[PDB]
Design a protein around this ligand. Structure first.
Ligand SMILES: [Mg+2]
Ligand SMILES: [Mg+2]
Ligand SMILES: [Zn+2]
Lengths: 186, 150, 87, 129, 81
RNA sequence: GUCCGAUUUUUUCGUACUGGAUUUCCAACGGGGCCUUUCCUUCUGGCUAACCUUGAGUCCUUGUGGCUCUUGGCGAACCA
């Protein structure tokens, strides 16, 4: 019934639709790009300023979907960056966060560990770099009081985010409030 | 340190910093599960299952590569045992020791060791009763013990 | 130590060791004071003027008085490649 | 078996100070430790400290800057009424002019100076000077 | 001694420590892909296998178990990963 | 600004007391609120959407019940 305004949930906004036709562009490539790309819509995008003369794109995928977006993440992110100069592309599955239950803010039926602030923030970072896993973290409490979380990314295939690395920081910082710093094996 | 020995050993495993991975595995959870159940129906314990999977089938762990620890899978498939593997092997053990006592009756060390093992069994079963995996009463009986390990 | 009207009371302010920031006691007679020479335009050691560290008795007695002293020289430049943080 | 964890933490620090070191290792890493370490850094009795992510409970590397005499724990974490902070500070602090007795109040963990201001109380964690 | 980079131990010393005593504990064991010079079966094993591992058929034997690192049976190949 | 012993001891020289709202002029500190996925949970009051609903009306490259007004039900969300 629709190739364009369909491949996305809820109507606003424009930059999305702009991206949407970038999605239907690849959809004209039947056996592969038309295959596992029609099930993959997204919820929303937020633009964010980076350190250089560009900006990064936070595409908020749902959750059960995030599996498939990952399988195309390699190709799709790159083709997106071809059709978008001055834009770093990152996929961020939006996860629900539940408040730490309280005598006030109470909710029956427990509260899974995955709806945890610190647990979701922990996944945001996993997705905010997608390929290349992490081999360690640190947290530095600076002699004046403030945390700086050092993330240690693999040496394998970092090439796909070696440059975005400077941008990933501002993404995280916008979402949460905590400052990142990345680094590599030696 | 040790519970019943006076030993202070640290010989343990060492699980890797890697809740995901391995990049060389390539076999999908759904597949490995159907191998676990294959073995569990051929009468095999979680311990000695993940021993085969760690060895011949190059599957490092089960909580990774499937998202679920082995016994949890067996229970879902209704291949949950009657009493737990620890409790079991303890009860089997205590049985055999007693069976040795019954002919060699001067083995005072034997008797001593039984007192240790059966302490363990009860301590266990107590906990297992506490978290609903054994019925409120249960308790390990010696006279009936040989039966429970068949 | 101040007072009522900010005036500097307290008989004397003691040295602090330069490897442990620990006060040098008036009777700490294993506490040492090294004085190293600054050198002007090539060779000639500048008289009167020193680069100076102070090493407390405890550091010296425990035999840390060389390694610690070494870090101190390399980090005021006086050494290249001898001390090495990560070991 | 480990019992206090905030005991063995403060001890290592205490021990490492005495022997002239300017860095410690702290396994394992409880939040109570860090909040304590925070309180202990707010007045610079320690320097920078960095969490280490084992996939477990943690480690910590604290940098020492001398001037620490004793960072102590008090066990059991006694109940302190408001006019009893006056009494602990009397007992386990060097002079009226400094030092700290950090607590646990419902208003978070804090040094006794602070609780004195916000007018709060609870259990006692230990002390620093 | 007295002052050192705890957060950054050397490598040649970190490889000298015990399995559990490094900066973050990790396994010293690996995995081998092992076949025999007759058959074409890529049977992947574990460095310290406790079972007499074989190829899928042929009643052959890849390794014998021991008190530590398994013993690759005679003439057989292996790449480590 | 003046009680009051006013201090090294010279003249128009300096050691406890009170007044102070708001300056953006630095500092510390403490109380109360919000926003950031976060006032939840119970109840009641308010403002009512949507929702089928009776009755009068149109539109459709399709009975599509889409749109409107009309009858009385039922009260998401939202605020307190
Ligand atoms: Mg031990
Ligand atoms: Mg005992
Ligand atoms: Zn073979």
């Amino acid at each position: 019934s629709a190739p364009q305004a369909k491949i996305l949930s809820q109507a606003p906004t424009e930059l999305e639709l702009q991206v949407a036709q970038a999605f239907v562009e690849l959809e004209n490539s039947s056996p592969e790009l038309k295959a596992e790309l029609r099930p993959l819509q997204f919820k929303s995008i937020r633009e964010i300023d980076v350190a250089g003369g560009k900006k990064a794109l936070a595409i908020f995928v749902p959750v059960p979907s995030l599996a498939g977006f990952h399988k195309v993440q390699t190709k799709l992110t790159r083709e997106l960056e071809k059709k978008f100069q001055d834009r770093h592309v990152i996929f961020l599955a939006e996860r629900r966060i539940l408040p730490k239950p309280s005598r006030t803010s109470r909710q029956v039926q427990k509260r899974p560990r995955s709806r945890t602030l610190t647990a979701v923030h922990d996944k945001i970072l996993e997705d905010l770099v997608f390929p290349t896993e992490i081999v360690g973290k640190r947290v530095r409490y600076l002699v004046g009081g403030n945390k700086i979380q050092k993330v240690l990314l693999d040496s394998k295939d970092v090439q796909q985010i070696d440059y975005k690395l400077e941008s990933f920081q501002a993404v995280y910082n916008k979402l949460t409030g905590k400052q990142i710093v990345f680094e590599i094996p030696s | 340190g040790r519970m019943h020995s006076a030993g202070k050993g640290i010989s343990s495993s060492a699980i890797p910093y890697s809740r995901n991975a391995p990049a060389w595995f390539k076999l999908s959870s759904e597949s490995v599960i159907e191998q676990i159940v294959k073995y569990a129906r051929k009468g095999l314990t979680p311990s000695q299952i993940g021993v085969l999977l760690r060895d011949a089938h190059g599957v490092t762990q089960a909580r990774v590569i499937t998202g679920n620890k082995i016994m949890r899978i067996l229970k879902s498939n209704g291949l949950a045992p009657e009493i737990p593997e620890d409790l079991y092997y303890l009860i089997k053990k205590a049985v055999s020791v007693r069976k040795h006592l019954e002919r060699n009756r001067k083995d005072k060390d034997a008797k001593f060791r039984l007192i240790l093992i059966e302490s363990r069994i009860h301590r266990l079963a107590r906990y297992y009763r506490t978290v609903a995996v054994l019925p409120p009463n249960w308790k390990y009986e010696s006279a009936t013990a040989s039966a429970l390990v068949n | 130590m101040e007072n009522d009207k900010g005036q500097l009371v307290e008989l004397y302010v003691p040295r602090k060791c330069s490897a442990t920031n620990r006060i040098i006691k008036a009777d700490d007679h294993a506490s040492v004071q090294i004085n190293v020479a600054k050198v002007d335009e090539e060779g000639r050691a500048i008289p009167g003027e020193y680069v100076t560290y102070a090493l407390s008795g405890y550091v010296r007695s425990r035999g840390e008085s060389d390694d610690s002293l070494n870090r101190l020289a390399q980090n005021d430049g006086l050494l290249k490649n001898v001390w090495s943080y990560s070991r | 078996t480990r019992s206090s964890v905030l005991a063995d933490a403060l001890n290592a620090i205490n021990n490492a100070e005495k022997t002239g070191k300017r860095q410690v290792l702290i396994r394992p890493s409880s939040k109570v430790i860090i909040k304590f370490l925070q309180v202990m850094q707010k007045h610079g009795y320690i320097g920078e400290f960095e969490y280490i992510d084992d996939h477990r409970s943690g480690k910590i590397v604290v940098q020492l800057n001398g001037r620490l005499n004793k960072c102590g724990v008090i066990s059991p974490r006694f109940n302190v009424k408001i006019g009893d902070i006056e009494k602990w500070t009397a007992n386990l602090l060097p002079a009226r002019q400094f030092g700290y007795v950090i607590l646990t109040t419902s208003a978070g963990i804090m040094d006794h100076e602070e609780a004195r201001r916000k007018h709060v109380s609870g259990k006692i964690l230990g002390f620093v000077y | 001694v007295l002052v050192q980079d705890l957060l950054h131990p050397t490598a040649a010393s970190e490889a000298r420590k015990h399995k559990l005593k490094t900066l973050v504990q990790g396994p010293r064991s690996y995995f081998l892909d092992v076949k025999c010079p007759g058959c074409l079966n890529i049977t992947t094993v574990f460095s310290h296998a406790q079972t007499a591992v074989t190829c899928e058929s042929c009643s052959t034997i890849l390794c014998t178990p021991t008190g530590g690192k398994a013993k690759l049976s005679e003439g057989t190949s292996f790449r480590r990963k």
